[PDB]
Amino acid sequence: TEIHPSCVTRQKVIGAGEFGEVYKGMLKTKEVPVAIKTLKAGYTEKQRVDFLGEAGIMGQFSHHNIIRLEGVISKYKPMMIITEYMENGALDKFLREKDGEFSVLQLVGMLRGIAAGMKYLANMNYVHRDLAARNILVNSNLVCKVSDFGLSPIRWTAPEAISYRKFTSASDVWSFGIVMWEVMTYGERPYWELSNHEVMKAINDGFRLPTPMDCPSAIYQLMMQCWQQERARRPKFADIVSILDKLIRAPDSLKTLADFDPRVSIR
Numbered sequence: 001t002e003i004h005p006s007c008v009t010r011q012k013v014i015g016a017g018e019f020g021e022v023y024k025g026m027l028k029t030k031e032v033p034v035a036i037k038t039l040k041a042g043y044t045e046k047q048r049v050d051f052l053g054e055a056g057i058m059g060q061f062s063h064h065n066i067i068r069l070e071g072v073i074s075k076y077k078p079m080m081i082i083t084e085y086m087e088n089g090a091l092d093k094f095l096r097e098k099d100g101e102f103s104v105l106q107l108v109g110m111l112r113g114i115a116a117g118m119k120y121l122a123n124m125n126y127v128h129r130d131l132a133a134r135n136i137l138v139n140s141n142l143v144c145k146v147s148d149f150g151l152s153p154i155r156w157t158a159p160e161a162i163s164y165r166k167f168t169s170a171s172d173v174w175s176f177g178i179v180m181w182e183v184m185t186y187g188e189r190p191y192w193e194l195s196n197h198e199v200m201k202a203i204n205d206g207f208r209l210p211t212p213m214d215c216p217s218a219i220y221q222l223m224m225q226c227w228q229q230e231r232a233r234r235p236k237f238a239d240i241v242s243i244l245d246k247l248i249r250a251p252d253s254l255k256t257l258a259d260f261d262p263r264v265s266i267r
């Protein structure tokens with residue numbers, strides 16, 4: 001959809017872009033709130049291709065858990081990508097600002113949503129490469145929409161994508177496992193203070209993130225299987241969506257928690 005510049009008003013700056021700013025604003029069709037990514041004058045050929053390519057793929061995406069493209073401005077400068085505005089913003093910040101305020105069923109439902117959007121992207125043969133809670137937006141219905149703000153990560157990346165740039169939907173499944181851990185922990189930093197290199201050496205040496213507090217056994221088992229070293233052994237996003245859907249629809253299944261590895265405090 002081509003949007004006319006007269007239908008768009010920018011208000012706030014809310015981020016930075018490839019060669020532009022990200023704004024909040026209002027779109028006419030009263031006025032829907034929207035987010036606006038601009039491509040400022042002097043952008044390169046390559047930048048133009050990535051910008052309008054991004055706009056095109058977003059326009060072909062149509063799924064509940066994928067950021068919805070309101071429209072594009074391509075015939076006027078600056079060029080713009082206009083999406084629905086997501087009131088609660090990015091999931092990582094959102095969960096960190098709302099620590100403990102959600103039920104396990106709400107959290108697992110946020111994970112089903114993300115995994116559904118990811119299954120859709122993998123099925124459309126789109127490799128995300130930067131799946132993290134910082135790239136997931138949350139609307140006022142707690143509905144998670146996969147997005148990409150393109151500031152690209154090691155900690156969320158599969159070992160083969162690190163080691164030799166093999167980015168696939170199986171590498172996105174690894175990232176999704178990290179996202180599961182981010183969610184169930186209310187936005188804790190994966191591996192905490194380990195450096196990037198220490199994170200790579202811990203993974204390749206077989207360490208995996210431990211269980212979040214208050215995490216259903218089935219949810220930890222699932223993220224653990226997203227972190228298989230052998231990429232062919234990881235669940236497909238269809239497997240993930242399926243398991244999450246069955247857990248949610250039979251919610252007692254989430255009452256069995258995985259053990260939490262503590263630290264001492266004694267009577």
Ligand SMILES: Cc1ccc(C(=O)Nc2cccc(C(F)(F)F)c2)cc1Nc1nc(-c2cccnc2)nc2c1cnn2C
Nearest residue numbers: 014015022035036037081083084085086089146147148149
């Ligand atoms: C304005 C905008 C422009 C682009 C995208 C986006 O996600 N594009 C994209 C690119 C590749 C792949 C995919 C995917 F497959 F994953 F879907 C999406 C999202 C937004 N919308 C927003 N951006 C930002 C934003 C914030 C900071 C930096 N960049 C962007 N904040 C927003 C919104 C909507 N609400 N809010 C709060």
